[PDB]
Design a binder for this molecule. Sequence first.
Ligand SMILES: *[C@@H]1O[C@H](CO)[C@@H](O)[C@H](O)[C@H]1NC(C)=O
Ligand SMILES: *[C@@H]1O[C@H](CO)[C@@H](O)[C@H](O)[C@H]1NC(C)=O
Ligand SMILES: *[C@@H]1O[C@H](CO)[C@@H](O)[C@H](O)[C@H]1NC(C)=O
Ligand SMILES: *[C@@H]1O[C@H](CO)[C@@H](O)[C@H](O)[C@H]1NC(C)=O
Ligand SMILES: *[C@@H]1O[C@H](CO)[C@@H](O)[C@H](O)[C@H]1NC(C)=O
Ligand SMILES: *[C@@H]1O[C@H](CO)[C@@H](O)[C@H](O)[C@H]1NC(C)=O
Ligand SMILES: *[C@@H]1O[C@H](CO)[C@@H](O)[C@H](O)[C@H]1NC(C)=O
Ligand SMILES: *[C@@H]1O[C@H](CO)[C@@H](O)[C@H](O)[C@H]1NC(C)=O
Ligand SMILES: *[C@@H]1O[C@H](CO)[C@@H](O)[C@H](O)[C@H]1NC(C)=O
Ligand SMILES: *[C@@H]1O[C@H](CO)[C@@H](O)[C@H](O)[C@H]1NC(C)=O
Ligand SMILES: *[C@@H]1O[C@H](CO)[C@@H](O)[C@H](O)[C@H]1NC(C)=O
Ligand SMILES: *[C@@H]1O[C@H](CO)[C@@H](O)[C@H](O)[C@H]1NC(C)=O
Lengths: 135, 135, 135, 135
Amino acid sequence: SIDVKYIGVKSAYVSYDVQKRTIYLNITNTLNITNNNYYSVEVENITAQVQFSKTVIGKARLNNITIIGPLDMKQIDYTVPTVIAEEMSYMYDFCTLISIKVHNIVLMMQVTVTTTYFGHSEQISQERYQYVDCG
Amino acid sequence: SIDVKYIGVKSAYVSYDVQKRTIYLNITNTLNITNNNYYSVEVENITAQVQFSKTVIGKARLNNITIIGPLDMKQIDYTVPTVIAEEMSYMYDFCTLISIKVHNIVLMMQVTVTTTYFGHSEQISQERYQYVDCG
Amino acid sequence: SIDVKYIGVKSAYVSYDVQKRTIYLNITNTLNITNNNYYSVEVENITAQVQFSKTVIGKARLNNITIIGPLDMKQIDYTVPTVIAEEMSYMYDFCTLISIKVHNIVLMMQVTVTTTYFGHSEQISQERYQYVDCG
Amino acid sequence: SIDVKYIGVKSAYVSYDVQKRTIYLNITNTLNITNNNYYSVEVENITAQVQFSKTVIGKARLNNITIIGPLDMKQIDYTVPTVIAEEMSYMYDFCTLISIKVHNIVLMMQVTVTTTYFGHSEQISQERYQYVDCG
Ligand SMILES: *[C@@H]1O[C@H](CO)[C@@H](O)[C@H](O)[C@H]1NC(C)=O
Ligand SMILES: *[C@@H]1O[C@H](CO)[C@@H](O)[C@H](O)[C@H]1NC(C)=O
Ligand SMILES: *[C@@H]1O[C@H](CO)[C@@H](O)[C@H](O)[C@H]1NC(C)=O
Ligand SMILES: *[C@@H]1O[C@H](CO)[C@@H](O)[C@H](O)[C@H]1NC(C)=O
Ligand SMILES: *[C@@H]1O[C@H](CO)[C@@H](O)[C@H](O)[C@H]1NC(C)=O
Ligand SMILES: *[C@@H]1O[C@H](CO)[C@@H](O)[C@H](O)[C@H]1NC(C)=O
Ligand SMILES: *[C@@H]1O[C@H](CO)[C@@H](O)[C@H](O)[C@H]1NC(C)=O
Ligand SMILES: *[C@@H]1O[C@H](CO)[C@@H](O)[C@H](O)[C@H]1NC(C)=O
Ligand SMILES: *[C@@H]1O[C@H](CO)[C@@H](O)[C@H](O)[C@H]1NC(C)=O
Ligand SMILES: *[C@@H]1O[C@H](CO)[C@@H](O)[C@H](O)[C@H]1NC(C)=O
Ligand SMILES: *[C@@H]1O[C@H](CO)[C@@H](O)[C@H](O)[C@H]1NC(C)=O
Ligand SMILES: *[C@@H]1O[C@H](CO)[C@@H](O)[C@H](O)[C@H]1NC(C)=O
């Protein structure tokens, strides 16, 4: 890829920003831009293109064949008991979190048993992430 | 991809922003822009293009064949009991969270047993994420 | 890739930013830009292109064959009990977190048993990450 | 890759930034830029290109064959009990964290049993990371 940018606050080509408590007086700003961009991206120039997938089974004897794809989960267990017993007591809870299997982003591409792929694949993630804020 | 940008606050090409408590006086701003963009993206220039998938089964004997695709979940268990017993007691709870299997984004593409793919695939995620804010 | 940038606060080509408590007086700014960009990225110039995958099974005898793809999870167990017993007691909790299996980003590409791939693959992640902030 | 940059605060080509408590007076700034960039990246110039994968099974006898892909997890156990007993006692907790299996970023590419790959692969990660901040 081209021009993949994370900018926290502010982006510009030409900036004349003026901040608090300023005396901006008697200024002459002269700007003469010639900014040209020419892109040629993922361009195929092919006379003859042949792409294929072939699966042939002849005079075979197949018996007792097991295929299991990825991400197989079996006999998983989560046990998070919470017991609170109080007797003539004081208790104060502020900003208490019990998190089990919390997900923000899941991107899945070409998760298979068999794949044949011709071409371009991309995954882009940009974020600002903040889980707990309790001030 | 081209020009994938995360900007937290502010974006511009030319900015003359003026902030609080300012004296902007007697200013001459002269701007002369020539900004041209020429894009040629994912362009195929092919005389002959042949693409195919072929699956042939001849004089075969298949018996007792099991195929299982991905993301198989079996015998999963979540146990999150909460017991609160009070006797002549005080209790204050503020901003209490029990989260089990919480998801924000799930993007799935080409999740299969068998795939044949010709071309372009993309996934883009941009976000600002904040789970808990209790001040 | 080209031009993959993480900028924490501010980006520019030409900046004349002025900050707090300033006397900007009697300034002459003259700017003459010729900024051109020519990109030729992922460009195929091929007369003849032949790409294929072939799987042939002849006069074979297959028996008792097991294939298991990746990321297989079996007999996993999480046990996080919390017991609080109080008797004529004081207790104050602020900003308490129990986290089990917390995920922010999961990107999966070509997670398979068998793969044949022709071309370009990319994964880009940009972030600002902050788990706990309790001041 | 080309031009992969991590910039903590500020980026520019030409900067005339002025900070707090300044007297910027009687300044003449003259800038004459000729900045051109020519890129030719991942460019194939091939007369004849032949790429393929072939798997042939003839007159073979296969029996009792087990293949297991990577990242196999079996009989994993986590035990994190927390017991608090109080009797005529004072207890104050601030900014307490129990973390089990916490993940920020997971990028997976070509995690398979068998792979044949022709071309370009890339993974880029840029971040600012902060786990706990409790002042
Ligand atoms: C600004 O420039 C003009 C022209 O040179 C001049 O007459 C004027 O007095 C100046 N002002 C200040 C505040 O110096
Ligand atoms: C600005 O740019 C153009 C193109 O290069 C040039 O011909 C023109 O004379 C320039 N003008 C000034 C004021 O410098
Ligand atoms: C593309 O292919 C043709 C045939 O070989 C060639 O004559 C032509 O100049 C090429 N053009 C580009 C832009 O590469
Ligand atoms: C601003 O510029 C004009 C023209 O040069 C001048 O007459 C005027 O007095 C200036 N004002 C200040 C506040 O200096
Ligand atoms: C601005 O740009 C054009 C194109 O380059 C140029 O011909 C023109 O003279 C410029 N004008 C000024 C005031 O510089
Ligand atoms: C595309 O293909 C034709 C045939 O080879 C060629 O003559 C032509 O110049 C090409 N054009 C471009 C824009 O690549
Ligand atoms: C700024 O420049 C002008 C022109 O040279 C001059 O007349 C003016 O008095 C200057 N102002 C200050 C504050 O020196
Ligand atoms: C600015 O750039 C153009 C292109 O190089 C040049 O022809 C022009 O004379 C320049 N103008 C000035 C004021 O220097
Ligand atoms: C591409 O291929 C053709 C055929 O060999 C050649 O004549 C042409 O000059 C090439 N063009 C480029 C841009 O590489
Ligand atoms: C700045 O420059 C001008 C021109 O040389 C001059 O007349 C003016 O008095 C100067 N101002 C100061 C503050 O020295
Ligand atoms: C700036 O750059 C151009 C291109 O090299 C040159 O022809 C022009 O004379 C320059 N202008 C000045 C003021 O130096
Ligand atoms: C690419 O290949 C052709 C054929 O050999 C050659 O004539 C041409 O000059 C090449 N062009 C480039 C840009 O390498």
